[PDB]
C-alpha cells in the first residue's frame, strides 16, 4: 500500500498539491515503525504505538515540498503563507504527519525553479480546499480584468532550492495522512 | 526471492510463442512483473511492465502493437505471447520483479529491477 | 529516446584493484532512476545500484554509486575473483531505455 506515496519519484509544488485515495489495503505499518533516522514523526491525535487496532478506510496521503524552516505550519492551528493560502488543516486534526530531508533527490547545482506556492491573496483558505486558480488578482480600485499593471499582482513564484544552503532552506518532503474514516 | 522460469521452446518462423514465469515467496500485490529480451550476445531491451490489481500494461516502441501480456492471479503466475515470431527473434527472456512504475498509480519510484528468475530460450529460425 | 552509451565496454585487470565505470547520456535525465545491474557470465542479472547511491540487498561494501546530472560513473573499490562480470545502466525517466554493455576481464 505505502508504495507511491513515499518512494515516489516527483512530488507536485504546494499551491497544486496531489492527494491520493488509498483504500482496502490491510496495515502497511510495520514499515514506517522502522523508518529511522525519519527526522520527524511528531504526529497528532492517536499514539504512534496504538496504530495497529484502528479501522480507517480513507487513509488519506498528501505529499508536497516545502522549506525545512515551514513545515511547523502544517500543525493543527497556525499562521503563515503555506497556513493560510496553500494548504489548510483544521484545528481538529485527527491524522499523522511524516517529514524528512531530501536535499539530495532535489536540489541542482543551478538551482530547481520548479516549486510553485502563492505569496498573496485576499481571503485566507477554507478546510480542505484546492487554489488551482492562476486567475490574474488585485487589490485597489482598477479593475485590470486581465490586463496587467501596478496594483494587480500574479500570484505565484519560485523557489530557489540549492545544495549548499542551510537546513532551514533545505527542501523537506512532507507526507501527511489525514485519517478518516 | 523464489522466482522459477520455464523451460525452452523451439519453433518455426511465423508462429505465436508463449513463455510463462511462476514466481513466489512474497505477496504478489504491490509489486510489477517486468520482462527482459536479450539476443544471443547483443545486449538488453526492454520488454514490458505486467502489472497487477489492474491489469494496465506498458509496452515500449519498438514493438507497440506487436505483445500481449497477461496475470494469472491464481498461481501468481506470468505469461508473454510474443507474436509473428520473426527470423531476428531468437533471444533469451528474462522474468524479473519491476519496482519502477509502482502497481497502484502510474508513477516512477526509486528502484529498478529486484529479483530475476531463471531465464529461458526461445528457438524460432526454421 | 534517450540514447545511454557507457564507454568503455572492455576492461583489463589483475585480481585486486579499484575499477572506474562510466555512464553518459543525452539530455539531463533525473538522479531518481539511474539502477545499475550485474550479469555474470551464466546466470541471471541481479540488482546493484539504484537511485545512483543506494546499495540493494545483500550488496557488498565494494560499490560507491555516485552522479547527477548528465554523466555518471559507478566506482568499484576492490577486485574479488566473484566479481568480474558485465554491468549495465538503466534510466526511468523517458519511458525506459537499457545500455549497451561493459564488460570486465582478467589480465
Known amino acids: 500500500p505505502f508504495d507511491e506515496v513515499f518512494n515516489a519519484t516527483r512530488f507536485a509544488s504546494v499551491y497544486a498539491w496531489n492527494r491520493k485515495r488509498i483504500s482496502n489495503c490491510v496495515a502497511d505499518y510495520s514499515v514506517l515503525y522502522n523508518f529511522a533516522p525519519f527526522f520527524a514523526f511528531k504526529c497528532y491525535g492517536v499514539s504512534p504505538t496504538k496504530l495497529n487496532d484502528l479501522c480507517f478506510t480513507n487513509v488519506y496521503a498528501d505529499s508536497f515540498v516545502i522549506r525545512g524552516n515551514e513545515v511547523s505550519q502544517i500543525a493543527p492551528g497556525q499562521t503563515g503563507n503555506i497556513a493560510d493560502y496553500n494548504y489548510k488543516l483544521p484545528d481538529d486534526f485527527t491524522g499523522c504527519v511524516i517529514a524528512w530531508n531530501s536535499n539530495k533527490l532535489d536540489s541542482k547545482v543551478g538551482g530547481n525553479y520548479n516549486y510553485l506556492y502563492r505569496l498573496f491573496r485576499k481571503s485566507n483558505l477554507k478546510p480542505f480546499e484546492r487554489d488551482i486558480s492562476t486567475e490574474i488578482y488585485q487589490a485597489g480600485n482598477k479593475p485590470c480584468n486581465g490586463v496587467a499593471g501596478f496594483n494587480c499582482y500574479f500570484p505565484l513564484r519560485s523557489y530557489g532550492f540549492r545544495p549548499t544552503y542551510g537546513v532551514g532552506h533545505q527542501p523537506y518532503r512532507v507526507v501527511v495522512l489525514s485519517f478518516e474514516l | 526471492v523464489q522466482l522459477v522460469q520455464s523451460g525452452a521452446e523451439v519453433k518455426k518462423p511465423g508462429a505465436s510463442v508463449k513463455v510463462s514465469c511462476k514466481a513466489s515467496?512474497?505477496?504478489?500485490?504491490?509489486?510489477?512483473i517486468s520482462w527482459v529480451r536479450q539476443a544471443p550476445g547483443q545486449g538488453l531491451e526492454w520488454m514490458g511492465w505486467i502489472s497487477t490489481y489492474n491489469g494496465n500494461t506498458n509496452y515500449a516502441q519498438k514493438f507497440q502493437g506487436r505483445v500481449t501480456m497477461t496475470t494469472d492471479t491464481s498461481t501468481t503466475t506470468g505469461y508473454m505471447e510474443l507474436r509473428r515470431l520473426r527470423s531476428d527473434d531468437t533471444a533469451v527472456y528474462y522474468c524479473?520483479?519491476?519496482?519502477?512504475?509502482?502497481?497502484?498509480?502510474?508513477?516512477?519510484?526509486?528502484?529498478?529491477?529486484?529479483?530475476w528468475g531463471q531465464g529461458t530460450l526461445v528457438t524460432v529460425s526454421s | 529516446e534517450i540514447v545511454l552509451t557507457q564507454s568503455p565496454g572492455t576492461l583489463s585487470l589483475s585480481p585486486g584493484e579499484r575499477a572506474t565505470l562510466s555512464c553518459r547520456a543525452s539530455q539531463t535525465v533525473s538522479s531518481t532512476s539511474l539502477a545499475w545491474y550485474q550479469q555474470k557470465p551464466g546466470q541471471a542479472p541481479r540488482l546493484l545500484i539504484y537511485?545512483?547511491?543506494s546499495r540493494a540487498t545483500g550488496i557488498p561494501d565494494r560499490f560507491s554509486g555516485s552522479g547527477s546530472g548528465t554523466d555518471f560513473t559507478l566506482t568499484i573499490s576492490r577486485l574479488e575473483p566473484e566479481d568480474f562480470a558485465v554491468y549495465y545502466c538503466?534510466?526511468?525517466?523517458?519511458?525506459?531505455?537499457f545500455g549497451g554493455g561493459t564488460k570486465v576481464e582478467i589480465k
Open positions: 524479473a520483479r519491476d519496482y519502477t512504475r509502482g502497481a497502484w498509480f502510474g508513477e516512477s519510484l526509486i528502484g529498478g529491477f529486484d529479483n
Open positions: 537511485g545512483a547511491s
Open positions: 515467496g512474497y505477496p504478489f500485490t504491490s509489486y510489477g
Open positions: 538503466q534510466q526511468h525517466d523517458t519511458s525506459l531505455t
